[PDB]
Swiss-Prot record:
Oligomeric form and interacting partners: Homodimer. Interacts with host STAT2; this interaction prevents the establishment of cellular antiviral state. Interacts with serine protease NS3. Interacts with host TRIM23; this interaction leads to NS5 ubiquitination.
Enzyme active site: K56 (for 2'-o-mtase activity), D141 (for 2'-o-mtase activity), K177 (for 2'-o-mtase activity), E213 (for 2'-o-mtase activity)
Protein name per UniProt: RNA-directed RNA polymerase NS5
Topological category with respect to the lipid bilayer: Peripheral membrane protein
Biological role stated in the UniProt entry: Replicates the viral (+) and (-) RNA genome, and performs the capping of genomes in the cytoplasm. Besides its role in RNA genome replication, also prevents the establishment of cellular antiviral state by blocking the interferon-alpha/beta (IFN-alpha/beta) signaling pathway. IFN-I induces binding of NS5 to host IFN-activated transcription factor STAT2, preventing its transcriptional activity.
Length: 261
C-alpha cells in the first residue's frame, strides 16, 4: 500500500506506447555513441566506459555518497563498469570483481583504462554463495527487474541479506543497489541496516523511470522512508505528465594505462 507499490501497479497498466514514453520522461543519460563505436572496434586504450554503470558510480563518488578507498570488492560486476571506475581512483589500492558471466549473464570486458592491472575479475561466480572477504569498500549492483512487485521485493531482500554478511566483516564504504526500496519489508530491512551500519538510500538521476531502484550508500544519512517516498512521488508525477524528454550528458572518459610501482 506504499506509494511505490501503487506506482508499480500503474506502471504495468500503461499501454506499450505509454510505457516507452514514460521510461525516458525527464531523465538524464550519458551519450554512449563514442564508447559503443570504440568497443565495437576492439579499442582498449581510449578510456571509454564498458557500460553505463561507470557514469552511475561516478555520480555517487563525485558528490561524496560513497568514498572509493583501499580494497574494493564489486559483487555482480558484469562487464566491469564499476571495477574500471574504481581502479582509476588514486585512493583505491586493489579491485576484486565477481560475476556470473554465463548462460546469458554479461562477462567481464577487458579494456586497459587506468588501473586495469589492479583489477582481478572472477566470473562463473554466484555471489550469494561466495564466502565474504575483508575489504574497505563494498560495491554491489545486483537486482533484476520483475513486473511483479512481490518478486522485486523478494529479489531485493535476498541481495540485502547477502550484502549484510559482507558488511558484517567491517567495511568503511559501500554502494549497494536496492531494486525495490518501495516494498514494505525492504524499507524495514533498510531501517535495520541503517541502525547497524549507517548510510541511507539515494536515487541516481541516471536511473530510468521504469525502475524504482535506489542505492544504499555510506556517505549520507537520512530518513529512508522519507527519501524513498520522495522518489515514488517523482516517478508518479512523471507518469501523469509523459514527454519522453531526455537530457544527454557526456559519458565518462578515464585516463589509460597501468598504475605502477
Ligand atoms: N505496461 C508496461 N510495462 C512494461 C513494459 N515493459 C516493461 N514494463 C515494466 O517496466 C519495468 C522496467 O523493466 P525494464 O526497464 O523493461 O528492464 P530493466 O532490466 O529494468 O532495465 P533495462 O535493461 O534498461 O530495460 C518492468 O519491471 C515492467 O513492470 C511494457 O511493454 N508495458
Ligand atoms: N547471483 C549473482 N552472482 C553474481 N553475479 C550476478 C548475480 N546475479 C546477477 N549477477 C550479475 O550482476 C550484474 C548486474 S549489472 C552490473 C553493471 C556494473 N555495475 C557495470 O558498471 O557494468 C549482471 O552482470 C548480472 O549477470
Amino acid at each position: 500500500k506504499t506509494l511505490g507499490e501503487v506506482w508499480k501497479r500503474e506502471l504495468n497498466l500503461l499501454d506499450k506506447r505509454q510505457f516507452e514514453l514514460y521510461k525516458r520522461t525527464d531523465i538524464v543519460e550519458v551519450d554512449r555513441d563514442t564508447a559503443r563505436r570504440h568497443l565495437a572496434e576492439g579499442k582498449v586504450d581510449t578510456g571509454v566506459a564498458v557500460s553505463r554503470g561507470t557514469a552511475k558510480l561516478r555520480w555517487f563518488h563525485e558528490r561524496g555518497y560513497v568514498k572509493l578507498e583501499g580494497r574494493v570488492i564489486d559483487l555482480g560486476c558484469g562487464r566491469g563498469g564499476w571495477c574500471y571506475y574504481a581502479a582509476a581512483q588514486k585512493e583505491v589500492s586493489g579491485v576484486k570483481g565477481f560475476t556470473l558471466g554465463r548462460d546469458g549473464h554479461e562477462k567481464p570486458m577487458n579494456v586497459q583504462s587506468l588501473g586495469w592491472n589492479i583489477i582481478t575479475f572472477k566470473d562463473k561466480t554466484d555471489i550469494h554463495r561466495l564466502e565474504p572477504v575483508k575489504c574497505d569498500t563494498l560495491l554491489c549492483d545486483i537486482g533484476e527487474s520483475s513486473s511483479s512487485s512481490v518478486t522485486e521485493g523478494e529479489r531485493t531482500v535476498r541481495v540485502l541479506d547477502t550484502v549484510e554478511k559482507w558488511l558484517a566483516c567491517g567495511v568503511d564504504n559501500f554502494c549497494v543497489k536496492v531494486l525495490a526500496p518501495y516494498m514494505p519489508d525492504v524499507l524495514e530491512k533498510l531501517e535495520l541496516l541503517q541502525r547497524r551500519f549507517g548510510g541511507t538510500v539515494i536515487r541516481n538521476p541516471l536511473s530510468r523511470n521504469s525502475t524504482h531502484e535506489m542505492y544504499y550508500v555510506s556517505g549520507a544519512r537520512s530518513n529512508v522512508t522519507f527519501t524513498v517516498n520522495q522518489t515514488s512521488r517523482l516517478l508518479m508525477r512523471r507518469m501523469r505528465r509523459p514527454t519522453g524528454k531526455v537530457t544527454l550528458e557526456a559519458d565518462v572518459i578515464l585516463p589509460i594505462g597501468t598504475r605502477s610501482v
